[PDB]
Structure 1
């Protein structure tokens, strides 16, 4: 038998989306799961069930690929009744002009020095959506957002600047009360949360490899919210 931690945070990357399959940046673009991405969500649900997770609450972004993955996972876990919370502050970076582009054209758009910052750091900010470009933030779901908080082109640093207050104000307090929390996250959001919890720097984070779709991080905490262990579980 094993000792259970005081609280647990599982962060799961959502399954493959259509933009991911097309190799095109999505960001706030609301691309849905593919057939494979749906099977990724079921596989992640079976993965979490075999590890015996029973969650008290689940968090997702406003993006369908995150929400649909969350619903499938809870379906597999037989926990469809638990509190689910969706908030735009957990959204992936708003890629602005890069929204919808092939992930290979950015070598053309960016100088060689700029490309180095894009992959090795988190401070490079994409330019805003061009005139006439379909801006995902114009979707009616964001109509209640204050225009001054709506991003148009976000570096990973800027994304974390808006997501961190939500993490600290809504998610951390539940972990401090001994809750088991699931977050179905986007790749960059998960990386930022890992850097914060483990006290890494930007360079170490981008050195690490990206977790495949459906892979999960498990953070375990004691009653003082000290980090006790990080595990990577994957299909």
Structure 2
């Protein structure tokens, strides 16, 4: 019996510039911080026992804003990091299309076919993300917690819960920054109660 709130890091500078981050990072924009604060207000009534985040700067920064001074510990776990994108990190979509067009097409169109020389495949991410989630549940029986992570991680997790194949990884809804997803874990089963809700966000950008 555990309730899991899942969200994505707020808008960063590279998000705006359409630059892939991966394990690299960039600071939250003004909009990002605003959205993260809007989320913190939305959860002010929710009794969070803890907050888990990836070790990425943007994830941690989002988590601090949401906590907003409240007495809640923040734990960092590498298994919650966004997918490792090697050579693509720091580069724009056009720059990447110039480098490896086929792999780039697969990334977005045929996830199951994505197989880089340097970097993780979607299945590597799904496996470590699910382990982290299970470890969190194991430590919070009867409690409610918040998990601040990333886009691909969130998508691999929804795919696992909804029992869908990775080839359909990029299925709707789009996981916007600071969006709210709620998972109810009961009887050893993950039930998706809410997915990608953005009721608290003013201007929604597909970034």
- Give the alignment's TM-score, normalised by structure 2: 0.85
1:208 counterpart = 2:172: yes
Alignment correspondent of 1:3: none
Unaligned 5+ residue runs, structure 2?
201-207
Superposition map of 1:40-119 within 5 A: 40-49=35-44, 52-75=45-68, 80-112=70-102, 114-119=103-108
Superposition map of 1:131-146 within 5 A: none
Alignment correspondent of 2:203: none
Alignment correspondent of 2:182: 218
1:163 counterpart = 2:129: yes
Q: What's the Cα RMSD here?
A: 2.0
Partners of 1:24 and 1:101 within 8 A in 2: yes
1:117-172 per-residue CA deviation (whole Å, 9 max, x = no partner) reads 211343413443xxxxxxxxxxxxxxxxxxxxxxxx1222222233333332x212
Q: Secondary structure at the match of 1:208?
A: coil
1:67-121 per-residue CA deviation (whole Å, 9 max, x = no partner) reads 011111011xx6x322211011211111101011102222222345x44421134
Unaligned 5+ residue runs, structure 1?
1-5, 129-152
Q: Secondary structure at the match of 1:62?
A: coil
Paired residues in the alignment total 197
User: Aligned pair in 2 of structure 1 residues 94, 227: CA closer, same or farther (>3 Å)?
Assistant: closer
Compute the displacement of 1:22 (Å). Answer: 1.3
User: Aligned pair in 2 of structure 1 residues 122, 103: CA closer, same or farther (>3 Å)?
Assistant: same
What is the CA–CA distance in structure 2 between the aligned matches of 1:10 and 1:172, rounded to whole Å? 12
Alignment correspondent of 2:8: 13
1:22 counterpart = 2:17: yes
Query: Runs in 1 of length 4+ with deviation above 4 angstroms?
Result: none
What is the CA–CA distance in structure 1 between the aligned matches of 2:159 and 2:127, rounded to whole Å? 13
What is the CA–CA distance in structure 2 between the aligned matches of 1:39 and 1:103, rounded to whole Å? 26
Partners of 1:8 and 1:219 within 8 A in 2: yes
Larger Rg: 1
> Which of 120, 123, 139 is equivalent to 2:109?
120
